[PDB]
Design a binder for these strands. Structure first.
Length: 269
DNA sequence: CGTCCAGTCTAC
DNA sequence: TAGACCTGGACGG
């Protein structure tokens, strides 16, 4: 996911788990190289927040739950295919690598971290990844300032399309978003990043917030009340640039495809 | 059958 | 920097 997907995933955990109690251990699949979660409680609640391209779960035992335990926080990065599903315990999807089991009474469910390609990670601290800048959705002013006060950084020597994937400065922006942001302003993707940002000290940094916010406001992205194909219709409709007919595409220097209209820009391959 | 395509992370 | 990390779906032969 990108920032929107991580944000909706955290909203899904919050609404779906609002009225559930979990019990027992946190089960990791055998094949996952991520760490075992050392956590057990007779009764705990699960809640979530997103920052950029990370999601933090908090495991919160109820009063008197046993064995005595403090709340535990886990931070997830989703990679290409990470997600959360709430499923009936004996219909686990394939590639459910981390499971949280509801406690009785009621229908026995599992909250699953599901990750086909296993690019996703999680860590035992609750800490956000040091080096990631502020969330473009939830920390706009901090995000904007952190870019504008570090324009000398060699990160801004690169093309604007490459700079926009640098999670030190645009935590939450990924490949579809960089195409959608740059198309809204018709900024050539291979313009020098420092050139587009010096010109700023509704601009590019504001759309780094408002464009991803639009996706959040659509809802869906796997987390909606509407069907899987229904939310996917709404998203494909909203996209104006990414993989759309009549648009150009090039490989950036890490081989990631950038979609654009018109002038590729000066630093183009 | 085969190829190609869809965000870090780490060893050069 | 360039390759590694993975699975599956679309498409070509």
């Amino acid at each position: 996911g990108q920032g929107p997907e991580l944000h909706l995933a955290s909203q899904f955990v919050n609404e779906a788990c609002r009225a559930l109690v979990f019990g027992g251990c946190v089960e990791k699949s055998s094949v996952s190289r991520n760490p075992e979660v050392p956590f057990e409680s007779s009764a705990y609640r699960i809640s979530a927040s997103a920052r950029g391209k990370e999601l933090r779960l908090i495991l919160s035992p109820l009063p008197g739950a046993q064995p005595q335990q403090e709340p535990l926080a886990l931070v997830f990065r989703f990679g290409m295919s990470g997600s959360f599903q709430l499923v009936p315990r004996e219909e686990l999807p394939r590639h459910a690598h981390l499971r949280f089991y509801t406690a009785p009474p009621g229908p026995r469910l599992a909250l699953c971290f599901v990750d086909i390609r296993r690019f996703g990670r999680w860590d035992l601290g609750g800490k956000w990844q040091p080096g990631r800048g502020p969330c473009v959705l939830q920390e706009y002013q901090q995000f904007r300032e952190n870019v504008l006060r570090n324009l000398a950084d060699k990160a801004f020597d690169r093309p604007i399309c490459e700079a926009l994937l640098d999670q030190r400065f645009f935590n939450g922006i990924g490949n579809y978003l960089r195409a959608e942001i740059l198309y809204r302003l018709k900024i050539p993707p291979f313009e020098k990043a420092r050139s587009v940002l010096e010109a700023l000290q509704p601009d590019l940094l504001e759309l780094c917030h408002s464009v991803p916010k639009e996706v959040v406001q659509l809802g869906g992205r796997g987390y909606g009340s509407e069907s899987g194909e229904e939310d996917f219709a709404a998203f494909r409709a909203w996209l104006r640039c990414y993989g759309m007919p009549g648009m150009s595409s090039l490989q950036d220097r890490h081989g990631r495809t950038i979609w654009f209209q018109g002038d590729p820009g000066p630093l183009a391959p």
